Design a protein around this ligand. Structure first.
Ligand code: BJX
Ligand code: ATP
Ligand code: ADP
Ligand code: MG
Ligand code: MG
Length: 1164
């Protein structure tokens, strides 16, 4: 009975059910059983950690610890691998014996030898496939522990700027994605280092015995394949490494277009800004050409050399040896080269991965050495962010139990430092910290949000309590902003989630601390980017009413001393030293100056598959498929030619043999180049069009579509097409022809074999049909679960302070251990499913050999031909698997092309204008007059007009003001000028021309608009002044001085051509608004649209805008939508829009004069 269990483990019958289930229902984690504790990340991490700690007892070596953990399984796998190679060598020996016994006793009989071959091949591949699976179990178990192990370091890292920085996040994000995968892949290929070289030595050893001194000449050439393959391998790495480099920043430029896409389209240089991506795109391809050529060359040397090896052998033996070639010798030896081609060709891969693994392990072992770390009573505190210099000195604070212990100080002054020191985030060189450590609900000063729901973010692993959630939402005033969110409390936020504003981001985290039921809180300047009212609102209810009900301690570091009276305690610290400790009563009496000085500052106020091929052009598609037929035609004839030559058992046969191999070598070059030459042309045309369609795409699409999904087309899907399809498409065509031809050639040698084909074809089709859908679905799971694992590691890296603060370590560790477990299963059952296919094609493959062996014995053909059929029988079993696995890989990759093709045909905005271009003369908007005729404006095809029946004549040069109710038709009207929102009815006429009846790009260009938050794109300031570059350089300097920025610019390096960070990082927010004004003047628009211009702008900077607008654009007409409606008091023409209706339309003073209308209530 236990033989049944051994067999079932040996042929992966256990996977079979799942495979069949894939047809009935998609395979999913529910359908896949839970991973055994023998392979869960917990046990693997414990084993590896125990080995590593024993090593640390003996710096410890990662390599030796990994061996001590995972040695026995790879020893077993290598034993299986040897037993597989030795039985694989039965192939040539059995073929030689058969051919000798045929053509005229227990072992000599061909039948007994034929059956022996059938048992050998079955046993060879049962062993060989099992040997692969053991390493995969070992390899995955290794990746299981490492991801757990390096994660333990992340929670124990230190956030000091010295030990952690922007460079640090590069390693950890890359270590999980790359360093471990390279280390895992090495383990998959670990046996080969001592398996393939043993086979190579044996293969040559047999060759000499088969032929004589001739085979060495052929063996010598074949040996040279491996050094060639390594030299080609290195050149691929440099070609690919450069290729990734251009691709990496090409995505960065892609992100800039896709984020803030409206901004580019408004200024009409969406086309021009796109071409900046094409410039890098051509360089990306210029790396690919060097890569594609070398990949084709690697294919060439994989085929041209063995054919040159045989040509070197048989020609040699025809002269060095008096004996004419015998049929048994030829096809025994000729088979052996096919046995040796794969290990010689792939040996460059295993050694290269050995180099990569040793690179990563050294990289990963450097990682581990990275630096690792009265409610609150601290006396004589001395804290330092490393650097051997106490960043905090003379620290002595007391935080009374269950009271608001607020801290006051100036810029710097150890503001955030004091809190983190209590949390163990920095070294305390002296003193002692007494939590008189409980869980501390610290709030990060910076905004760090998980890629999950707001409710999860506020609960943060706490049991839901809507009444407790109610007060938190009310006290932190999270209720109103929630209504705006798509899925409410189930709105996923963060980098993966919806992009928020700074003020709303801060309140979410603060709410978390109130949610957590702990005696201690550390609220770090929540009002950093908040309105004063909400902070006052929080100080009344959230700070006092909510917390005092819980009677928990609060330590709120504050900069406005107006709330110190509310504070039960005040802590004054400056220069990293505590100025004085005491309440407001104690501080004023003891430190009279502090009371006045603070108050002084307080006073201060598969049809796609065919579609993909045709992309290059019919000739390129024809040439590839036409030539590949010819290559096999010559190759097969070469194998046949030996049958004609060896049937003799001699300058004729050799002569015809050299030329054939000459064409075979040459045709190998042609069929190698044509496939890749298709790939680049197929790669270029697909991506080239795609960027155009997105740019012309409607703005409404970008609002609907998540930003993560759109960029995925250019990041992953385009990567698949460019680099993965041409390799797979090459191997599929090569493997199919070999399988199609070999079955043909065997059948031609033994026509009786065709009767035996009827069942075998049926069996192959069912395995081909069923596995494809089972591998495709598992493939989706492997990618699906891999991505959140990387997201978790990046999320835990950022803001470890909170994780250490809340004592959320263990819960977060558990999340990772389960997250990786869901990922290993997907990859493990992807490899086990793939193994199931390989076993059941060899069990099928052995049947082809067995039928070919038995049929050939019965046939009385030429002794060479019966040998030839057996040769292809052995080759079939090798390639009959890759015709399925590559096809599955091709089918999945055709998914990317299907997605791209949809985007290509999905949508466009109508850039063409019906009226002739001659209609618009030079400087059309010069007049500046605006005319609105019964306008109706709604972006969504079926929706109410956001602007309805709008009509208000605008005089030329009139600083018209438009305002109303918050969220009631104010900004929509702005884009209505820019036609971004379709004017379903009515019309807008500017200077006697309806804006609808004009080319779209003309309308966008000749206008000037300023959004609420200006954004500056990567490049020079000249790039941000005129991407079109048409404007002469003289004007560019004028605008900055007009914008009052030229003086600031001159200090910057490079003068006018000064590099600018993407997104306006270099310039301050106030400075950012200055950049737009520079763009405003150059256009000579005569129309300015300042929608929410003063919004998100400091009052000091705001005065400049009013100074600039009244002066710089006096002749221009400024249609202002003010953040503060008071600025429209002096507007000569003022429009009020409520519910999409012109509720008030008169002069500013006349608005108060006519009646206490909407504007009058708006201001007052
Ligand atoms: C675990 C993922 O990877 C594997 C890994 C293995 C273990 C393994 O030494 N393979 C040999 C193949 C045989 C022909 C030697 C090999 C060696 C060097 C380079 C690649 C490969 N192979 C692996 C990558 C695909 C190309 C051939 C088996 C099977 C697989 C697999 O596909 O599932
Ligand atoms: N995590 C850290 N790593 C290294 N240096 C730090 C760290 N936190 C603070 N410092 C340094 O300690 C000093 C005082 O920082 P402090 O805690 O007062 O900041 P802050 O006033 O809260 O900051 P900000 O208001 O700019 O956000 C500064 O020199 C600062 O660079
Ligand atoms: N992307 C969107 N999709 C659907 N409706 C929106 C979208 N953005 C805004 N709205 C709604 O349309 C109105 C537009 O208001 P608007 O006139 O643009 O002034 P503001 O921009 O100051 O809200 C808002 O009340 C809002 O509720
Ligand atoms: Mg700070
Ligand atoms: Mg608005």
């Amino acid at each position: 009975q236990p033989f049944v269990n051994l067999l079932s483990k040996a042929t992966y019958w256990w996977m079979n059910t799942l495979i069949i289930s894939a047809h009935r229902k998609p395979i999913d984690l529910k359908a896949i059983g839970k991973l055994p504790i023998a392979m869960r990340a917990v046990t693997n991490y414990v084993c590896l950690k125990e080995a590593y700690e024993e090593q640390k007892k003996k710096t410890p070596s990662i390599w030796l610890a990994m061996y001590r953990a995972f040695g026995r399984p790879i020893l077993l796998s290598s034993t299986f691998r040897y037993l597989a190679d030795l039985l694989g060598f039965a192939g040539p020996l059995c073929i030689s014996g058969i051919v000798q016994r045929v053509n005229e006793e227990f072992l000599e009989n061909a039948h007994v030898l034929a059956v022996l071959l059938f048992l050998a091949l079955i046993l060879q591949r049962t062993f060989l496939q099992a040997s692969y699976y053991v390493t995969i179990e070992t390899g995955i178990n290794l990746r299981g522990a490492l991801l757990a192990m390096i994660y333990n370091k992340i929670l124990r890292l230190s956030t000091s700027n010295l030990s952690m920085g922007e460079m640090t996040l590069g390693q950890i994000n890359n270590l999980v994605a790359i360093e471990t995968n390279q280390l895992m892949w090495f383990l998959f290929l670990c046996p080969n280092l001592w398996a393939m070289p043993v086979q190579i030595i044996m293969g040559v050893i047999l060759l000499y015995n088969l032929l004589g001194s001739s085979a060495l000449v052929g063996a010598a050439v074949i040996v040279l394949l491996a050094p060639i393959q390594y030299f080609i391998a290195t050149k691929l790495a440099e070609a690919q490494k450069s290729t990734l480099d251009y691709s990496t920043e090409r995505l960065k430029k892609t992100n800039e277009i896709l984020k803030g896409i409206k901004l580019l389209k408004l200024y009409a240089w969406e086309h021009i800004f796109c071409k900046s991506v094409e410039e890098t795109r051509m360089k990306e391809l210029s790396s690919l050409k060097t890569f594609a050529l070398y990949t084709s060359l690697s294919i060439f040397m994989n085929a041209a050399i063995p054919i040159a090896a045989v040509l070197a052998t048989f020609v040699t033996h025809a002269y060095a040896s008096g004996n004419n070639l015998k049929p048994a010798e030829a096809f025994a030896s000729l088979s052996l080269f096919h046995i040796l081609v794969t290990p010689l060709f792939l040996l460059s891969t295993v050694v290269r991965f050995a180099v990569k693994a040793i690179i990563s392990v050294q990289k990963l072992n450097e990682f581990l050495l990275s630096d690792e770390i009265v409610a609150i009573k601290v006396t004589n505190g001395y804290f330092s962010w490393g650097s051997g210099l106490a960043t905090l000195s003379n620290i002595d604070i007391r935080i009374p139990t269950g009271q608001l212990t607020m801290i006051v100080g100036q810029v710097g002054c150890g503001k955030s430092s004091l809190l983190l020191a209590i949390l163990g985030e920095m070294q305390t060189l002296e003193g002692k910290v007494y939590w008189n450590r409980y869980s501390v609900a610290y709030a990060a000063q910076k905004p760090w949000l998980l890629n999950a729901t707001v409710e999860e973010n506020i609960t943060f692993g706490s049991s839901f309590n809507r009444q407790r959630y109610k007060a938190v939402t009310d006290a932190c005033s999270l209720q109103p902003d929630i209504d705006l969110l798509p899925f409410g409390d189930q709105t996923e936020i963060g980098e993966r989630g919806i992009n928020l504003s700074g003020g709303q981001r801060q309140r979410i985290c603060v709410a978390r601390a109130l949610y957590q039921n702990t005696n201690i809180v550390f609220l770090d300047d929540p009002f950093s980017a908040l309105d004063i009212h909400l902070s006052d609102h929080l100080m009344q209810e959230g700070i006092l009413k909510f917390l005092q009900d819980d009677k928990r301690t609060v330590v709120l570091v504050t900069h406005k001393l107006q709330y110190l009276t509310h504070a039960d305690w005040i802590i004054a610290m400056k220069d990293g030293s505590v100025l004085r400790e005491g309440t407001l009563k104690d501080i004023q009496t003891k430190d009279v100056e502090l009371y006045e000085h603070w108050k002084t500052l307080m006073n201060r106020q598969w049809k796609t598959c065919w579609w993909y091929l045709t992309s290059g052009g019919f000739f390129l598609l024809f040439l590839m498929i036409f030539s590949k037929l010819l290559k096999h035609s010559v190759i097969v004839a070469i194998d046949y030619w030996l049958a004609t030559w060896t049937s003799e058992y001699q300058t004729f046969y050799v002569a015809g043999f050299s030329i054939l191999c000459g064409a075979g070598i040459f045709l190998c070059l042609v069929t190698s180049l044509t496939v890749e030459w298709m790939g680049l042309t197929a790669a270029k045309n697909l991506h080239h069009n795609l960027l155009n369609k997105i740019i012309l795409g409607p703005i409404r699409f970008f609002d609907t579509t998540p930003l993560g999904l759109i960029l995925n087309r250019f990041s992953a899907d385009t990567n698949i097409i460019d680099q993965h399809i041409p390799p797979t498409l090459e191997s599929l065509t090569r493997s199919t022809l070999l399988c199609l031809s070999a079955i043909g050639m065997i059948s031609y040698a033994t026509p009786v074999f065709l009767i035996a084909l009827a069942p075998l074809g049926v069996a192959f089709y069912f395995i081909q049909k069923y596995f494809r859908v089972a591998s495709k679905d598992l493939q989706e799971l492997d990618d699906s679960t891999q991505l959140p694992l990387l997201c978790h590691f990046s999320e835990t890296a950022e803001g470890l302070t909170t994780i250490r603060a809340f004592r959320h370590e263990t819960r977060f560790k558990q999340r990772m251990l389960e997250l990786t477990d869901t990922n290993n299963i997907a990859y493990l059952f992807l490899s086990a499913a793939n193994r199931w296919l390989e076993v059941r094609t060899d069990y099928l493959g052995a049947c082809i050999v067995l039928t070919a062996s038995i049929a050939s014995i019965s046939g009385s053909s030429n002794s060479g031909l019966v040998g030839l059929g057996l040769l292809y029988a052995l080759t079939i079993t090798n390639y009959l698997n890759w015709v399925v696995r590559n096809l599955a890989d091709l089918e999945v990759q055709m998914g990317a092309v299907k997605k791209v093709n949809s985007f290509l045909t999905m949508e466009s905005e109508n850039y063409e204008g019906t009226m002739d271009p001659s209609q618009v003369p030079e400087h059309w908007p010069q007049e500046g007059e605006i005319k609105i005729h019964d306008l109706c404006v709604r972006y969504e095809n079926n929706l109410k007009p956001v602007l309805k029946h709008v009509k208000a004549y605008i005089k030329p040069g009139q600083k018209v003001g438009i305002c109303g109710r918050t969220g009631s038709g104010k900004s929509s009207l702005s884009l209505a000028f820019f036609r971004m929102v379709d004017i379903f009815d009515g019309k807008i006429v500017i200077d006697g021309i309806d804006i609808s009846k004009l080319p779209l790009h003309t309308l966008r260009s000749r206008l000037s608009i300023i959004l609420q938050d200006p954004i500056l794109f990567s490049g020079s300031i000249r790039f941000n002044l005129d991407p079109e570059c048409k404007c002469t350089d003289d004007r560019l300097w004028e605008a900055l001085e007009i914008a009052q920025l030229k003086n600031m610019v001159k200090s910057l390096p490079g003068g006018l051509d000064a590099t600018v960070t993407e997104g306006g990082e270099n310039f301050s927010v106030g400075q950012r608004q200055l950049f737009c004004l520079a763009r405003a003047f150059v256009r000579k628009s005569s129309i300015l649209i300042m929608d929410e211009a003063t919004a998100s702008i400091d009052m000091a900077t705001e005065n400049i805008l009013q100074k600039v607008v009244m002066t710089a654009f006096a002749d221009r007409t400024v249609v202002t939508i003010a953040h503060r409606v008071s600025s429209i008091m002096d507007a000569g023409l003022v429009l009020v829009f409520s519910e999409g209706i012109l509720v008030e339309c008169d002069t500013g003073p006349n608005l108060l004069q006519h009646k206490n209308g909407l504007f009058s209530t708006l201001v007052m």
